[PDB]
């Protein structure tokens, strides 16, 4: 019966495979072949954060575009005033281990986690006058790597033990579990609209979530290795992914196939972190070769770089008003370049 | 200039002293990475000396602040989240004696760890445990069931040495790592001081790296 | 979270005194201190200022030279030492906290007070209309004036509001002019561009009679305002 089953899973993939060629009136490129290019755009630094002592693994900014927060591996999450370059708080955390962080929308938590297996939530609002740890979820199997807000009262954590979860803060129990993934789950993004998020582990394939339901919707397999990052298009529409194979690729939600990839000749290294800019015309992506690259998303050709670094770079983030754009380094540096 | 932003300047560099205070003190720790197999001497290591994601534990010897991380718990594709240990001192392993079935993929995960892009310079250090339970079991059972291109005596210091060969080859690059060895006892407490050992030439030559000679 | 303060009396002219502001429920080390002064029957009056650390110990002239101000961290005490008092030296003395960061909330609790009687280029801030008499239910308007305008090139603009009730503490409504406090219902509002400002209440109702006191933070010496008085 093994083999059977085995037969008709082969034969409705064949039949989806066909399904999603049908479709295939055009590509994006040829479409997109009269658009005037963006040319060359050389952004510069405007500040840089010292402070860190270890390497910087992950960092988030606020709602209002004004503060930051990283989190680095020597045991220090730092939350960044950029504006005028002081720090307003300096939590030390009970793991050194950070693989993770978040911003609440409305400002008033933060959230963290990494290889011990739990998500602590820090309150920075408190009426005593120093951050404390508010609720610690210890539900998942696995090294935490990603973990997202969706109001100050839920979350959705990403794990390596190929599930997500979602979180109800205030009774500390798991909501819902998503499963159907085979590797380990790396990135997490959360739609404008916050109804749907996506996620890639590590099979090369990305999965469509629905938030309320608690099923898989839609599953994407162009890659050929690991995927890294993930990051929704502004409109909700479409979404990019980077992987280990040095290229990215644009996945549109409604077409349900591949539309477009990034790569070239030059390039042999991984992508760590992958982010738009707020027209969606720009995508920014850091890779392992201490550099990041910016991509026009619809020409498929390179209009700049950004190497400001001297080590790996691990995170990547952009404000909600499109202003500047922020970076961190193995090297223990941030940079604001705009 | 500054209406009330001198005391938010203030708070700023009191917050950088701090950091800088705890840091000086984070580097004057030496940490230590211990693997080896399941249901192995992992933690007999660690019980032997006065000592689910990390199990992180410390101790203290000649002044000298030491971290170990056992980080056998986690069923992960360590490829993912080893580059986290790539400043450690050391690579603290251990291998059954006894058992004969847990060798073949310590061999294999041995040498994973040897030739991991990482680890090209961190002096690993290899523990051999359970060593009475050994001496007998090879008398009772002939090594070669699992060796069959043995051919040495039957003799515990023939394979012994035999095993001790058969692990310390599957160092590729000998020119920069500095493999260790040590039989591990069942008493006579040791161990720390032979990983002090280890730590002490370590130290040594950071410090040649800091000063410039090499 | 509470503060305490002891060490008044009765001191004949050219004495000595030092009062005593004892901390708990919070973290006290991170946290500037004030304190503040009230005539018999007068408005409040800014006397010294201690931040965080020790690094800026700002006084007052009236009294500058024979003040002293300092505090014990682990011990969690604020001190006041007074030489040389003289007749307009009695008063009620408060005890004040304040913590500076980005959008923080300074000023927030103020203390109990204690009394002391002694036996026998400034902002200026204008608060003329010192009686309205007021109905419940009815809307009510307060407003305050100032020198020079307190808009900063950051955009900030440093003007307080601070509410008095009969035979209590004051306590903190509006930081900054727009920003409301912690706890306050939601009907009190604040408003006003440099130069001129504005405090709004809806709904008016009973345990909101009392004093209303202005305050600027914009540079050293801290200026209160005459203050204006709510009655039935």
């Known amino acids: 019966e093994l083999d059977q089953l085995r037969q008709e899973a082969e034969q409705l993939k064949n039949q989806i495979r066909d399904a999603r060629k049908a479709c295939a009136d055009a590509t994006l490129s040829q479409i997109t072949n009269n658009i005037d290019p963006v040319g060359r755009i050389q952004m510069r630094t405007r500040r840089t954060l010292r402070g860190h002592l270890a390497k910087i693994y992950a960092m988030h900014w606020g709602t209002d575009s004004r503060l930051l927060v990283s989190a680095s591996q020597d045991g220090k999450l730092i939350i960044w005033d950029s504006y005028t370059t002081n720090k307003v708080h300096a939590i030390p955390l009970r793991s050194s281990w950070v693989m993770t962080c978040a911003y609440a929308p409305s400002g008033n938590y933060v959230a963290c986690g990494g290889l011990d297996n739990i998500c602590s939530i820090y309150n920075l609002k408190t009426r005593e006058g120093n951050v404390r740890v508010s609720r610690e979820l210890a539900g998942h199997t696995g090294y935490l790597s990603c973990c997202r807000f969706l109001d100050d009262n839920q979350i959705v954590t990403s794990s390596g033990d190929t599930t997500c979860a979602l979180w109800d803060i205030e009774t500390g129990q798991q909501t819902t579990t998503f499963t159907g993934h085979t590797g380990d789950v790396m990135s997490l993004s959360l739609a404008p609209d916050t109804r749907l998020f996506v996620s890639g582990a590590c099979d090369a394939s990305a999965k469509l979530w629905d938030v309320r339901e608690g099923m898989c919707r839609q599953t994407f397999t162009g890659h050929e290795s690991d995927i890294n990052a993930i990051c929704f298009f502004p409109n909700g529409n479409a979404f990019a992914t980077g992987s280990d194979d040095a290229t990215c690729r644009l996945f549109d939600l409604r077409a349900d196939q591949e539309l477009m990839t990034y790569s070239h000749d030059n390039i042999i290294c991984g992508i760590t972190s992958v982010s738009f800019s707020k027209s969606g015309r720009l995508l920014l992506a850091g890779y392992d070769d201490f550099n990041c690259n910016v991509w026009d998303a619809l020409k498929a050709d390179r209009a700049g770089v950004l190497a400001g670094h001297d080590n790996r770079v691990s995170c990547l983030g952009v404000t909600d008003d499109g202003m500047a754009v922020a970076t961190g380094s193995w090297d223990s540096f941030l940079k604001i370049w705009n | 200039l500054s209406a009330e932003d001198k005391a938010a300047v203030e708070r700023s560099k009191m917050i950088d002293r701090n950091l800088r205070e705890d840091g000086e003190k984070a580097a004057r720790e030496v940490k230590l990475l211990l693997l080896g197999a399941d249901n192995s001497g992992k933690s007999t290591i660690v019980k032997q000396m006065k000592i689910t994601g990390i199990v992180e534990t410390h101790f203290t010897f000649k002044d000298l602040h030491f971290k170990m991380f056992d980080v056998g718990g986690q069923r992960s594709e360590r490829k993912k989240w080893i580059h986290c240990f790539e400043d450690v001192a050391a690579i603290i392993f251990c291998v059954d004696l006894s058992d004969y079935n847990r060798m073949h993929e310590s061999m294999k995960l041995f040498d994973s760890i040897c030739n991991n892009k990482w680890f090209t310079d961190t002096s690993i250090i290899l523990f051999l445990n359970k060593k009475d339970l050994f001496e007998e079991k090879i008398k009772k059972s002939p090594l070669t069931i699992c060796y069959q291109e043995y051919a040495g005596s039957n003799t515990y210091e023939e394979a012994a040495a035999y095993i001790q060969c058969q692990f310390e080859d599957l160092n590729k690059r000998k020119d920069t790592k500095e493999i260790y060895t040590h039989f591990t006892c069942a008493t006579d407490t040791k161990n720390a001081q032979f990983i002090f050992d280890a730590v002490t030439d370590v130290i040594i030559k950071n410090n040649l790296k800091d000063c410039g000679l090499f | 979270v509470q503060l305490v303060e002891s060490g008044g009396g009765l001191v004949q002219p050219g004495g000595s005194r030092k009062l005593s502001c004892s901390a708990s429920?919070?973290?006290?080390?991170?946290?500037?201190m004030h304190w503040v002064r009230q005539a018999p029957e007068k408005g409040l009056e800014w006397v010294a200022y201690?931040?965080?650390?020790?690094?800026?110990?700002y006084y007052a002239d009236t009294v500058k030279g024979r003040f002293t101000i300092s505090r014990d961290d682990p011990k969690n005490t604020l001190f006041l030492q007074m030489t040389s008092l003289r007749s307009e030296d009695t008063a009620m003395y408060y005890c004040?906290?304040?913590?500076?960061?980005?959008?923080?909330?300074?000023?927030?609790?103020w203390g109990q007070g204690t009394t002391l009687t002694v036996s026998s280029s400034d902002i200026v801030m204008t608060q003329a209309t010192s009686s309205v008499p007021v109905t419940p239910g009815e809307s009510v308007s307060i407003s305050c004036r100032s020198s020079?305008?307190?808009?900063?090139?950051?955009?900030?603009?440093?003007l307080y509001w601070f509410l008095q009730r009969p035979g209590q503490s004051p306590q903190l409504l509006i930081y900054?002019?727009?920003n409301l406090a912690s706890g306050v219902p939601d009907r009190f509002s604040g408003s006003g561009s440099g130069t001129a400002f504005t405090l709004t209440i809806s709904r008016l109702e009973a345990e909101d009679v009392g004093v209303y006191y202005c305050?600027?933070?914009?540079?050293?010496?801290?200026?209160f305002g005459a203050g204006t008085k709510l009655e039935l």
């Open positions: 429920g919070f973290a006290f080390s991170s946290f500037g």
């Open positions: 004040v906290r304040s913590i500076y960061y980005y959008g923080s909330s300074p000023f927030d609790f």
């Open positions: 900054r002019m727009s």
């Open positions: 305050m600027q933070h914009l540079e050293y010496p801290l200026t």
């Open positions: 020079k305008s307190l808009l900063h090139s950051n955009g900030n603009t440093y």
């Open positions: 201690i931040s965080s650390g020790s690094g800026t110990i």
